[PDB]
Design a protein around this motif. Structure first.
Motif, mmCIF file in Angstrom:
data_model
loop_
_atom_site.group_PDB
_atom_site.id
_atom_site.type_symbol
_atom_site.label_atom_id
_atom_site.label_comp_id
_atom_site.label_asym_id
_atom_site.label_seq_id
_atom_site.Cartn_x
_atom_site.Cartn_y
_atom_site.Cartn_z
ATOM 1 N N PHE A 196 0.830 -1.201 0.000
ATOM 2 C CA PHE A 196 0.000 0.000 0.000
ATOM 3 C C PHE A 196 0.877 1.269 0.000
ATOM 4 C CE2 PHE A 196 -2.253 3.495 2.039
ATOM 5 C CZ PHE A 196 -3.348 3.561 1.201
ATOM 6 N N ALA A 197 1.896 1.282 0.853
ATOM 7 C CA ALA A 197 2.819 2.411 0.912
ATOM 8 C C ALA A 197 3.538 2.615 -0.427
ATOM 9 C CB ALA A 197 3.802 2.244 2.030
ATOM 10 N N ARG A 198 3.936 1.533 -1.096
ATOM 11 C CA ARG A 198 4.499 1.677 -2.443
ATOM 12 C C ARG A 198 3.473 2.237 -3.424
ATOM 13 N NH1 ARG A 198 7.735 -4.091 -2.612
ATOM 14 N NH2 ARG A 198 9.449 -3.416 -1.235
ATOM 15 N N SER A 199 2.210 1.835 -3.281
ATOM 16 C CA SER A 199 1.148 2.302 -4.175
ATOM 17 C C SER A 199 0.905 3.801 -3.999
ATOM 18 C CB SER A 199 -0.134 1.506 -3.977
ATOM 19 O OG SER A 199 -0.883 1.936 -2.876
ATOM 20 N N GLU A 200 1.042 4.331 -2.770
ATOM 21 C CA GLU A 200 0.925 5.769 -2.572
ATOM 22 C C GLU A 200 2.092 6.449 -3.275
ATOM 23 O OE1 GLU A 200 0.956 6.138 1.700
ATOM 24 O OE2 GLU A 200 -1.124 6.802 1.714
ATOM 25 N N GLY A 201 3.322 5.951 -3.116
ATOM 26 C CA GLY A 201 4.441 6.525 -3.852
ATOM 27 C C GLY A 201 4.208 6.499 -5.350
ATOM 28 N N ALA A 202 3.663 5.397 -5.864
ATOM 29 C CA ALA A 202 3.377 5.279 -7.296
ATOM 30 C C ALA A 202 2.320 6.285 -7.734
ATOM 31 C CB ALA A 202 2.941 3.863 -7.637
ATOM 32 N N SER A 203 1.322 6.518 -6.891
ATOM 33 C CA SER A 203 0.304 7.525 -7.181
ATOM 34 C C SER A 203 0.931 8.914 -7.315
ATOM 35 C CB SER A 203 -0.736 7.548 -6.078
ATOM 36 O OG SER A 203 -1.766 8.467 -6.418
ATOM 37 N N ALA A 204 1.763 9.260 -6.340
ATOM 38 C CA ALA A 204 2.491 10.540 -6.345
ATOM 39 C C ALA A 204 3.302 10.671 -7.631
ATOM 40 C CB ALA A 204 3.388 10.594 -5.112
ATOM 41 N N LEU A 205 4.086 9.643 -7.930
ATOM 42 C CA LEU A 205 4.917 9.621 -9.123
ATOM 43 C C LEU A 205 4.053 9.776 -10.376
ATOM 44 C CD1 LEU A 205 7.697 9.343 -10.435
ATOM 45 C CD2 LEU A 205 7.439 6.874 -10.308
ATOM 46 N N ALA A 206 2.898 9.117 -10.414
ATOM 47 C CA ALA A 206 1.968 9.160 -11.550
ATOM 48 C C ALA A 206 1.339 10.549 -11.778
ATOM 49 C CB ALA A 206 0.869 8.067 -11.445
ATOM 50 N N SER A 207 1.345 11.398 -10.754
ATOM 51 C CA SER A 207 0.838 12.778 -10.878
ATOM 52 C C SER A 207 1.883 13.705 -11.499
ATOM 53 C CB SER A 207 0.399 13.322 -9.515
ATOM 54 O OG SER A 207 -0.816 12.706 -9.130
ATOM 55 N N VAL A 208 3.161 13.446 -11.237
ATOM 56 C CA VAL A 208 4.235 14.308 -11.750
ATOM 57 C C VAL A 208 4.892 13.812 -13.043
ATOM 58 C CG1 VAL A 208 4.692 15.694 -9.702
ATOM 59 C CG2 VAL A 208 5.865 13.483 -9.959
ATOM 60 N N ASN A 209 4.928 12.498 -13.246
ATOM 61 C CA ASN A 209 5.587 11.961 -14.432
ATOM 62 C C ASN A 209 5.043 12.508 -15.768
ATOM 63 O OD1 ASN A 209 7.750 9.888 -15.240
ATOM 64 N ND2 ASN A 209 6.009 9.384 -16.565
ATOM 65 N N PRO A 210 3.708 12.653 -15.918
ATOM 66 C CA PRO A 210 3.149 13.204 -17.174
ATOM 67 C C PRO A 210 3.586 14.642 -17.426
ATOM 68 C CG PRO A 210 1.416 12.117 -15.886
ATOM 69 C CD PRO A 210 2.625 12.255 -14.986
ATOM 70 N N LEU A 211 4.072 15.344 -16.402
ATOM 71 C CA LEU A 211 4.467 16.739 -16.561
ATOM 72 C C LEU A 211 5.820 16.869 -17.238
ATOM 73 C CD1 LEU A 211 3.236 18.117 -13.153
ATOM 74 C CD2 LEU A 211 1.962 17.909 -15.287
ATOM 75 N N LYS A 212 6.585 15.789 -17.307
ATOM 76 C CA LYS A 212 7.874 15.856 -17.958
ATOM 77 C C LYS A 212 7.744 16.222 -19.425
ATOM 78 C CE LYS A 212 9.700 11.878 -16.834
ATOM 79 N NZ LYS A 212 10.656 10.807 -16.371
ATOM 80 N N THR A 213 6.774 15.631 -20.135
ATOM 81 C CA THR A 213 6.595 15.953 -21.552
ATOM 82 C C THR A 213 6.244 17.415 -21.745
ATOM 83 O OG1 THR A 213 5.719 15.210 -23.705
ATOM 84 C CG2 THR A 213 4.094 15.565 -21.967
ATOM 85 N N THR A 214 5.387 17.943 -20.875
ATOM 86 C CA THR A 214 5.002 19.346 -21.027
ATOM 87 C C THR A 214 6.205 20.243 -20.771
ATOM 88 O OG1 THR A 214 3.496 21.126 -20.373
ATOM 89 C CG2 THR A 214 4.207 19.620 -18.670
ATOM 90 N N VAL A 215 7.092 19.811 -19.880
ATOM 91 C CA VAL A 215 8.314 20.579 -19.645
ATOM 92 C C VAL A 215 9.192 20.510 -20.877
ATOM 93 C CG1 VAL A 215 10.474 20.688 -18.365
ATOM 94 C CG2 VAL A 215 8.297 20.434 -17.142
ATOM 95 N N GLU A 216 9.427 19.305 -21.380
ATOM 96 C CA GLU A 216 10.322 19.112 -22.523
ATOM 97 C C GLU A 216 9.814 19.852 -23.772
ATOM 98 O OE1 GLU A 216 13.378 18.054 -22.426
ATOM 99 O OE2 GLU A 216 13.134 17.459 -20.364
ATOM 100 N N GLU A 217 8.512 19.760 -24.030
ATOM 101 C CA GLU A 217 7.980 20.432 -25.206
ATOM 102 C C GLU A 217 8.141 21.950 -25.093
ATOM 103 O OE1 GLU A 217 5.271 22.561 -25.780
ATOM 104 O OE2 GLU A 217 4.732 22.215 -27.871
ATOM 105 N N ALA A 218 7.847 22.493 -23.913
ATOM 106 C CA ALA A 218 7.971 23.941 -23.741
ATOM 107 C C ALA A 218 9.417 24.377 -23.959
ATOM 108 C CB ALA A 218 7.517 24.351 -22.358
#
Length: 120
Positions: free
Chosen positions: A5-27
């Motif tokens: 469960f604790a790993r799943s919370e970390g994965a949730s957190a990671l899943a909220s920020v990971n998609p932002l990498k593309t928006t950073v790279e494209e900009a």
């Protein structure tokens, strides 16, 4: 015990920020900066908002630094797990884009048994 469960919370957190990498790279590829906010890109300052609210995921908060960020300095996308359960309350997942190489690294300050796949 609750390790998965604790790993799943970390994965949730990671899943909220990971998609932002593309928006950073494209900009940055266009010479635009990136900023916080949930409007649309603003050509007056050439700033692209990340498009998510700081509180989009109730496990915690999302933050961009520097804000605005132009690519000439290291950039962090953090997820601070202020809303998590007991194992993870107060823990932080950071994605860092280093300006010297333009590459991303994930780090977590979670107790190590709870660090999810795709971070270290």
């Amino acid at each position: 015990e609750g390790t998965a469960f604790a790993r799943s919370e970390g994965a949730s957190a990671l899943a909220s920020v990971n998609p932002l990498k593309t928006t950073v790279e494209e900009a940055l590829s266009r010479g635009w900066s990136v900023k916080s906010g949930t409007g649309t890109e603003d050509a007056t300052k050439k700033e692209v908002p990340l498009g998510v609210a700081a509180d989009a995921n109730k496990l915690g908060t999302i933050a961009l630094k520097p804000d605005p960020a132009d690519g000439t300095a290291d950039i962090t996308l953090t997820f601070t797990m202020g809303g998590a359960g007991p194992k993870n309350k107060g823990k932080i997942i950071t994605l860092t884009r280093t300006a010297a190489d333009g590459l991303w690294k994930c780090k977590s300050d979670q107790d190590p048994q709870f660090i999810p796949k795709g971070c270290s």
